[PDB]
Assembly symmetry: C2
Homo-oligomer: 75 residues x 2
């Protein structure tokens, strides 16, 4: 994740009053995985939209909880 | 984008679905008979929501806006 996207997401989070983070890739173009103490949030690279998690990969025959899988790697 | 979204929803056992626009690129709003989900155009990822617009003064819950619109 580049410095410009990270700044936008951080700037937004800070303007909203939500504090620390770990910003990670997401398997959806134009957005990133943001771990906060208010949950995992999927935030657009421009910082204008947040979608609350979790995210599921539903391309297969059963849903895969991608948020949980990444949390276990990142906590 | 809709056959791909429709196939995913059918696989999931969702019968009633209303596909609407979403203000995030690559995504649509799915209004089900049990609530709102966000799905990518290729139908491969779902995000639970809600969605907030945070371009202004404070977070605005646009999912709630969509729901109340019916």
């Amino acid at each position: 994740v580049d410095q410009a996207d990270d700044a936008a997401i951080q700037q937004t989070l800070a303007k909203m009053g939500i504090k620390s983070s770990d910003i990670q890739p997401a398997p959806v173009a134009g957005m990133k995985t943001v771990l906060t103490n208010s949950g995992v949030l999927y935030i657009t690279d421009d910082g204008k939209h947040i979608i609350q998690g979790p995210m599921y990969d539903v391309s297969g025959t059963a849903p895969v909880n991608v948020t949980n899988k990444m949390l276990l790697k990142q906590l």
